[PDB]
Each structure stands twice: as structure tokens, then as C-alpha cells.
Amino acid sequence: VAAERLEPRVEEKDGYWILKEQFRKGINPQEKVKIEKEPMKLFMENGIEELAKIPIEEIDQSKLTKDDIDVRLKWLGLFHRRKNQYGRFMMRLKLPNGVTTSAQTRYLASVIRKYGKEGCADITTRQNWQIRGVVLPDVPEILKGLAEVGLTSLQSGMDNVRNPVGNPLAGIDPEEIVDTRPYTNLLSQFITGNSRGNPAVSNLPRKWNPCVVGSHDLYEHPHINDLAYMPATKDGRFGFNLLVGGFFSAKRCDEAIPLDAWVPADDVVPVCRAILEAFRDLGFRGNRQKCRMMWLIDELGVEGFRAEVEKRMPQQQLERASPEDLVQKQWERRDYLGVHPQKQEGYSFIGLHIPVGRVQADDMDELARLADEYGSGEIRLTVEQNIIIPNIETSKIEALLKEPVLSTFSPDPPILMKGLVACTGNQFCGQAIIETKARSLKITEEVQRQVSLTKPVRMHWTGCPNTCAQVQVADIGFMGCLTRDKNGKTVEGADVFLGGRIGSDSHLGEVYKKAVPCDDLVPLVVDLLVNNFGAVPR
Ligand code: SRM
Ligand code: SF4
Ligand SMILES: O=N[O-]
Ligand SMILES: [Cl-]
Ligand SMILES: [Cl-]
Ligand SMILES: [K+]
Numbered sequence: 001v002a003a004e005r006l007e008p009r010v011e012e013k014d015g016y017w018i019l020k021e022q023f024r025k026g027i028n029p030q031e032k033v034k035i036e037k038e039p040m041k042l043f044m045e046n047g048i049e050e051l052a053k054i055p056i057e058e059i060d061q062s063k064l065t066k067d068d069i070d071v072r073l074k075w076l077g078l079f080h081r082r083k084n085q086y087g088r089f090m091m092r093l094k095l096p097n098g099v100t101t102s103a104q105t106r107y108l109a110s111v112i113r114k115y116g117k118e119g120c121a122d123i124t125t126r127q128n129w130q131i132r133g134v135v136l137p138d139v140p141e142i143l144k145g146l147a148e149v150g151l152t153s154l155q156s157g158m159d160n161v162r163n164p165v166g167n168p169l170a171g172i173d174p175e176e177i178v179d180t181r182p183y184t185n186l187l188s189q190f191i192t193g194n195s196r197g198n199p200a201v202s203n204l205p206r207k208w209n210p211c212v213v214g215s216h217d218l219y220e221h222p223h224i225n226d227l228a229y230m231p232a233t234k235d236g237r238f239g240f241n242l243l244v245g246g247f248f249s250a251k252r253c254d255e256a257i258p259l260d261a262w263v264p265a266d267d268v269v270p271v272c273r274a275i276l277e278a279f280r281d282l283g284f285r286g287n288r289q290k291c292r293m294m295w296l297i298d299e300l301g302v303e304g305f306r307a308e309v310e311k312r313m314p315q316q317q318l319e320r321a322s323p324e325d326l327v328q329k330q331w332e333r334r335d336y337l338g339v340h341p342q343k344q345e346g347y348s349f350i351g352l353h354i355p356v357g358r359v360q361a362d363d364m365d366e367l368a369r370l371a372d373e374y375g376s377g378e379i380r381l382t383v384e385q386n387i388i389i390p391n392i393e394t395s396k397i398e399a400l401l402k403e404p405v406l407s408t409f410s411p412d413p414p415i416l417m418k419g420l421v422a423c424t425g426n427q428f429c430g431q432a433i434i435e436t437k438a439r440s441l442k443i444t445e446e447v448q449r450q451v452s453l454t455k456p457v458r459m460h461w462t463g464c465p466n467t468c469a470q471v472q473v474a475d476i477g478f479m480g481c482l483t484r485d486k487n488g489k490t491v492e493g494a495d496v497f498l499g500g501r502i503g504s505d506s507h508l509g510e511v512y513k514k515a516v517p518c519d520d521l522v523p524l525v526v527d528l529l530v531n532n533f534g535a536v537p538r
Pocket of ligand 1: 079090092122123124125126127128129130156157162163207209224246247248249250289292422423424428429430431466467468469470
């Protein structure tokens with residue numbers, strides 16, 4: 001790699017970070033959008049106030065404002081559903097470590113309730129909330145309402161640092177390695193500039209996913225993050241070994257690799273900043289399919305990239321990885337659904353199944369009520385799109401289990417439902433090839449009617465090759481496609497994936513059988529379960 005390749009390609013100008021004049025040749029259309037107008041200005045200079053007053057039909061008549069609503073608004077966590085729910089916006093939060101309060105949950109419910117049949121909410125595969133139905137004129141008030149209840153939606157889409165994932169059992173599991181909440185909280189504060197916006201990290205070449213590990217179970221999926229902090233003691237000091245570059249895309253899926261770096265626990269934010277600065281400064285900005293950070297690591301080599309991180313650290317110090325980390329490889333991933341004792345004597349948590357992560361306003365209010373009556377007003381989200389209510393006095397569990405709402409959001413659903421994960425799909429998502437959430441529930445129910453099993457088989461349904469529902473981590477994955485029935489008629493289908501493993505012995509699954517009509521999946525899946533996962537026909 002020539003020295004010229006290492007010249008930073010962006011510069012700070014008037015509070016924002018912009019591509020230098022000599023580094024604009026050959027850039028992709030998204031990079032052009034960012035040059036034409038700085039997206040962060042919609043929040044930080046309150047550009048949203050006037051934009052929100054323009055009728056959407058008028059907005060669509062000019063490129064600048066159309067790009068404002070379809071692209072730039074994703075820096076404020078607002079996602080126009082142009083194709084599938086025209087004029088409505090999904091809104092996505094920052095929710096480090098998946099932690100919400102009952103007051104926040106009620107606020108979110110109040111927002112979606114206004115929109116009737118156009119509103120609902122979802123738990124995401126980054127243990128985050130999305131709300132739906134939002135209309136542009138309401139955006140300024142919703143931004144204010146979120147701030148009032150201690151939430152932000154900043155920098156949650158597009159070329160930004162995505163939700164910091166942690167251990168859903170942080171602070172409460174007798175078996176945790178280290179409480180991840182202080183670290184994911186710090187990361188979210190850093191990323192969003194304490195909810196004011198942080199332009200230094202909002203002009204990346206592409207999205208970037210961080211997680212902090214605190215569980216032997218590896219609930220945080222460090223192998224598929226751009227930056228994963230693996231807890232490790234080095235020379236008698238507590239800190240983290242760093243994995244970099246994990247990502248999924250249509251073109252390529254890659255597991256994170258060691259940076260060969262250990263940082264003291266107090267250097268979590270400094271090293272996040274250094275890595276982001278290197279990626280921002282040096283990453284390719286052409287073909288969008290080659291802009292994730294791993295492509296930079298391959299271009300420079302991991303050592304070349306490491307040197308760029310090192311030079312951006314305070315005092316330019318970046319130790320080599322600890323020979324060992326704290327994660328025990330002898331481990332069986334633990335079910336968190338149901339009632340479990342906490343490390344605090346006399347307290348339990350309860351994991352509740354949320355079918356395909358989908359809730360309505362009334363459901364959110366009920367869950368918030370349970371959290372107040374039984375817990376400490378806290379609701380935790382998981383990356384399997386379920387919930388945990390922590391801090392419940394154990395003597396209250398008997399009463400809790402009789403609550404009517406637990407017949408719907410169950411502490412002990414059938415085993416295949418426990419492991420079922422599904423993305424948005426074509427109900428709302430414009431890129432989706434198939435419907436996912438309703439279909440996946442239907443198929444899973446039919447499969448479980450036919451077979452019993454004891455292995456915790458994890459089934460993931462994703463609507464297109466973007467693989468937001470991570471089919472490559474599944475025991476059985478389903479990637480949406482269009483295919484043909486016996487008569488040559490167009491039908492919805494799935495490419496079926498096998499081989500995904502999670503935890504310490506992780507492995508990326510691969511296509512097993514392409515183009516299976518969705519109406520033909522049940523027998524295929526039943527047989528796979530009997531033949532490979534010990535399932536028994538009923
Ligand atoms: C909601 C969520 C799936 C879910 O049902 O849980 C989701 C939904 C969308 N993803 Fe995703 N992604 C979700 C997690 C992911 C993950 C999984 C993860 O983070 O572990 C991946 C694969 C891992 C990765 O990125 O490395 C993922 C890879 C994509 C990609 C492909 C990335 C790439 O490099 O090519 C796109 C398209 C893009 O960004 O260019 C994308 C694009 C989208 C958009 C924003 C596209 C769009 O605007 O319509 C989807 C919004 C649909 C909607 O209305 O909900 N989504 N997406 C997840 C929100 C996470 C969050 O709270 O921030
Ligand atoms: S995998 Fe495809 S269909 Fe599913 S939410 Fe992501 S972009 Fe939409
Ligand atoms: O929002 N999925 O990158
Ligand atoms: Cl996006
Ligand atoms: Cl769309
Ligand atoms: K779920």
C-alpha cells in the first residue's frame with residue numbers, strides 16, 4: 001500500500017465532515033446526496049422544522065427535498081416507506097443494550113396509537129425499537145417527545161453507527177462476565193454526541209455495527225459485528241480484546257477477525273473513536289457493495305488497518321491482544337425465556353416471547369404495566385425480538401404467571417417459537433421480496449404441530465438478500481425469493497440455509513436448497529428436523 005492511500009479523504013468544515021475536493025471522483029449516489037446537503041443539519045440546525053411543513057407531494061417534486069425525506073432523514077432515524085406505505089415513516093431509536101423504561105414504552109405506544117391501522121411497533125435484531133405510521137408533519141413533536149422521555153433516534157440508519165448491542169442479562173445474571181450497560185451507554189453517548197448529534201462519526205462510507213460482550217453465551221453475536229469488544233484480562237488488568245469487520249450483505253458475509261488489540265476497559269470509547277476515524281478517513285466510497293469496513297481491512301491488510309487505528313489513539317498506544325479472553329468455550333447457550341433467579345437474592349427476571357417481535361399500542365401499554373407492577377419499570381429487548389422484565393421480587397412470580405397477557409406473550413412457548421426470528425418483510429419494507437412475519441409464524445406453527453423436539457433449533461426468516469434477520473446464523477434459515485410452482489406460476493419462495501452456529505463455536509450457514517415455494521416448506525422443514533435435529537413425528 002502506497003503512502004498516498006493513507007491520506008485522509010474527509011475534512012472538518014464548519015462543524016461537519018465532508019469529502020475533500022480531490023476525493024470526489026467516482027463516488028456513489030449516496031455520497032453525492034451527503035455532499036449536496038449535510039444530513040445532520042436537519043437535526044442540529046433544526047432543518048426538520050420547515051421541511052415538515054411542506055406537503056409531501058410538493059417535497060417529491062424536487063430532488064433536494066425528496067432526498068431529504070428518503071435518505072437524509074435516516075440520520076434522524078426516520079425511514080420513508082415509499083413503495084409499501086407511502087407517506088408514512090418507520091422510526092428507529094438508539095437503545096443501547098436493549099434497555100427501555102415503562103414510561104418510554106407508554107410514550108412510544110401513544111405515538112403509534114394515533115395512526116390506527118397504519119401504526120404498530122417492532123423489536124429488531126439489534127434489540128431495538130421501531131415504531132410505524134409516523135407522518136412527516138408530526139416529526140418535530142415526536143422528536144421533542146422522545147427527548148422528553150430520555151430517548152433519541154439519532155444516527156440509526158444509513159452511513160452511521162448502529163445500535164450498540166450488549167448482554168440482555170447485563171447486571172442480573174449470576175453467570176455474567178461483566179455488566180455491558182456502562183459500556184454500551186458510553187458508546188451510544190459518544191456516537192450521538194449525548195443526543196445532540198456527532199458529525200465526526202455520521203459521514204462514514206457505510207453502516208457500522210458495534211457490540212460489547214458480557215456473556216459466556218455470546219448473546220451479543222460478536223462474530224457478526226464491525227467492532228466487538230471481547231472481555232479479557234491482560235497482565236492482571238481488565239479490558240477487551242477487539243474483533244473487527246464482521247458483516248452481512250447480499251454479496252458477501254464475513255465473520256469479524258482479531259485486530260490483535262487489547263484495550264483497558266476505560267479505553268472503550270477512545271478505541272471506538274479511533275477505528276471510526278480510520279474507517280471514515282480511508283474507506284472506499286464507490287460501489288456501495290464494497291464499502292463496509294472489512295473491505296478497507298482487506299485493502300490495507302489487518303496490520304495496515306491496525307496501524308491506522310494505533311496512530312489515532314491518545315498517546316498512539318494500542319497494546320496487542322491478550323493471549324486469552326474471559327469467555328469460556330465450554331458453554332451451552334442458555335434459554336432466557338421463562339423465570340430465572342437474578343444474582344440479587346430474592347429477585348427474578350422473566351423472559352417473554354413476542355411472536356415475530358410485533359406489538360400493537362395496547363400490547364406495549366400492557367407490557368409497561370407488567371414492568372411497573374412486577375418489576376422496576378424496566379423492559380429489556382433481545383436480538384431474537386423478545387423481551388425480558390427484570391428485577392421482579394420472586395414472591396410475585398406466582399401472580400405474574402396468571403396474568404392474561406402471558407397467554408399471548410408467553411414465558412414458555414413451544415420450542416421452535418422460542419428461537420424464531422423474522423425481519424420486517426414486504427408488509428412495510430420496499431426491498432422485501434416476500435412477506436415474512438405472518439408467513440414465518442404460520443409455517444412454524446404447522447411444523448410444530450407435526451413434530452416434537454428438544455434441541456433448541458433456531459429458525460430465521462429474512463425477506464431479501466440484505467439478511468437483516470441473519471439467516472447465515474440460523475440452524476435453518478429462509479431467504480425470500482420468487483420462484484415457480486408446478487405449473488410455472490410465480491409464487492413466493494425461500495432459499496433454505498443450513499449450518500449456522502452461534503456462541504463461541506460460531507459458523508456461517510450457507511444455501512442448502514434454492515427456490516423452494518413457501519407452500520412447500522413445511523414437509524421440507526419437518527424432514528430436516530427429524531433427520532438432523534432429533535425431532536419426532538407426533
Ligand atoms: C428492522 C431490521 C430487521 C428486523 O426486523 O429486526 C432491519 C430492517 C431494515 N434494514 Fe437491515 N435491519 C435490521 C438489522 C440488520 C442486520 C442485523 C444486525 O445488525 O445484526 C443486518 C445484517 C448485518 C450487517 O449489516 O452487517 C442488516 C443488513 C441490512 C443491509 C445490508 C447491509 C450491506 O452492507 O449490504 C441493508 C441495505 C443497506 O444498508 O444498504 C439494510 C436495510 C434495511 C432497511 C433500513 C431498508 C429500508 O429502508 O427499507 C430495513 C427497514 C425495514 C423496516 O421498515 O423495518 N439492512 N440489517 C433491523 C434493525 C436493526 C436496528 O435496530 O438497527
Ligand atoms: S432483509 Fe430485506 S426485506 Fe427484510 S427488513 Fe432487511 S431489507 Fe427489508
Ligand atoms: O437497518 N439495517 O441495516
Ligand atoms: Cl439505512
Ligand atoms: Cl421503499
Ligand atoms: K420473538
